[model samples]
Target chain A: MLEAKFEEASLFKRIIDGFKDCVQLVNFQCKEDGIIAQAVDDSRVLLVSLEIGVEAFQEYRCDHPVTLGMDLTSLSKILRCGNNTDTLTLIADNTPDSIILLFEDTKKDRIAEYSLKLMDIDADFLKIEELQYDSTLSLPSSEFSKIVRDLSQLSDSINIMIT
Target chain B: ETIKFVADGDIGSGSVIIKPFVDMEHPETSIKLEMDQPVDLTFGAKYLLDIIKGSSLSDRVGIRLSSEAPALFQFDLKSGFLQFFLAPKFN
Candidate 1:
């Protein structure tokens, strides 16, 4: 099993939010397309058979379709761990115990892995109240990356007053 | 004696809050900070979850403090370093 784990520093939510805006199956389809995710709020989810455009490791190929049964939170972390526009190799020897990602730094090869407890995510299938957004906007990676960098300064949380 | 972490262009803006004493082990030490105004911003949880992913890699990261009233974040260096801050806003 090849696995990808991102450091928060890896911008995991950017990838997760992208999918939450469109589909739910990518949480499973991502391995084939090189990505996956689940909604933080799984109750109001709508099934979307859509795949968003994403950048993937062009050089490496999955020897087999990795069947991942990971929590969305864990998968997002893997996505954040790799450098954007870089290739990562994920490997797993058994089921739901541990996985690793290989990379390089300062003239040395490096790896990071996680030992996960199989989480209960089946409730995601029994969701309702899927978000109903009326508009859409798409931007390039550089543009969005800049936003994530800037967004670091939001008030801890926002309270909307319709005044 | 201090550390600074820079967020690559990837994760964007994040938050670093120093509670009165969430950790008693490191108490009474006045942590300093600096951060530039973030041109954009997002909720705190997304950024927090991302870095927690890297928590197992190493302990203590370098953070580049942008400002005081308005905070900025830099996190998860290949090496152990971290820089992040969050400011209060009421409107």
Candidate 2:
């Protein structure tokens, strides 16, 4: 069995929102540590990889690693039903064909349950190794977003230079 | 020493320059850079905007660029991270 509980739904929601734009179907590999997923966009020009450790969840358990393949767009729709502060719990059987999502409002005493059908996505798991880059920059995400948003209006391509 | 973004369109061209800085008061807003040598690359702006959707997942974003490889944009989560590898546009 695989089960993981998140203190808040916002984290998972943002993750789904982030990937749904470029990837439609993805396999969530639930392991002892956490969940890991990787998929390439249709154009093959972009790859998205995700890793969430067990420590990130309020409660997590996995007797054995299991791969749950599903459409992210559908998952995002379900997640949108719950509030950011709502607690979410994901449950899957050892040999699962579907996954259950439980959302709870601790204060309002409200609970919503949804079951999503899984898919068999034969996606190539791309292995990424540690590599050296010519330049590495860490900045505020908002700053990067702003730059991308502002520049996209001016041109279809952007040149990034580090000196 | 600096990170620059340049875009050229039919209308004109514009660029944004950022220099590394330390903000003890607002560490989340600080910019840090490490490089062995300078690197310049270009990519599709649409893909970058799509990658930016992850901004809400992390306060900081890490960008790794090389002359011949795809650029990596990463957002660290509470216990893990989300990474986007985007191929560059070759002129």
Candidate 3:
């Protein structure tokens, strides 16, 4: 069995919203310390990777490394119900069949449980090779979001030029 | 680093010039072009959105490029960093 608790429910909730536009199913590799996930769309045009440390969780425990195949759409829908103040707990057994999500709001003294069915996914592995990059750019997420949203309204496509 | 993005004018007739400012906190948007001469390149909007989304993870984004070279989009997070390299347009 696996049990983990997150201080804030929206931590993973918003992240799932961020990537839902492109990816559907994701391979969640759970470690004794934390969780890592990578997903590619059906077209393989985009790939998203996520990492969360054990410290992010109020409580985290895993006997061994476990890979859980998850349906992003389903999980996101369940997480969408989570309020910002709610505490989120995830529970699973060795059997890989279903996942139970528990959400608790201490202020309201209310708790909600959601049981989601899991599917057996073929191990679709993606290979990443190390290579030297010519240029690298970093910026704030809000700025990036605004750029993409603004340009999208004006035109269907845009070009990125770096000189 | 400084990001210089020049668009349609006396040069080329590109539709849009996207010059979003680097964040105020760590606008370390440094760039070192490793080329003997200056170069102008164009890229599709489809790929750029995939990269700009990294901004959600970090406050600062560093973009480095040479003439006619692939652009790397990076997002540094506390847990780990996400990096992407996209090939630039040929002409």
Winning model by lDDT: 2
Q: Mind giving the per-residue lDDT tens digits that candidate 2 earns over A23-86?
A: 8899899998899999889999999999999889999999898999999888888988879988
Candidate 2 ranges beyond 4 A from true positions: none
Mind giving the per-residue lDDT tens digits that candidate 1 earns over B1-91?
Answer: 1122223234343422231112356432323323222322222434443333323322333222221232322333232122223332322
**Per-residue lDDT of candidate 1, residues A1-163 (tens digit):** 5444332223333434433332333334334345433333333212222122234232333444544545555566565665643334555644445345554333345444434434334434322222321111221223234434444444233211110
On a 0 to 100 scale, what is the lDDT of residue A2 in model 2? 89
CA RMSD, predictions in order: 15.7, 1.2, 4.7
DockQ-based class of model 1: incorrect
- TM-scores of all candidate predictions against the true structure: 0.34, 0.97, 0.75
- Candidate 1: lDDT of A50? 17
Worst 10 residues of 1 chain A by lDDT: A132-141
Model 3 Cα lDDT, one tens digit per residue, A112-134: 99988888777676544234444
lDDT of 2 by residue, B15-70 (tens): 99999999988888989999888988889988998899998988999988887678
DockQ of each: 0.03, 0.88, 0.29
Provide the overall lDDT of each model, using Cα atoms, as 2-decimal numbers.
0.34, 0.89, 0.64
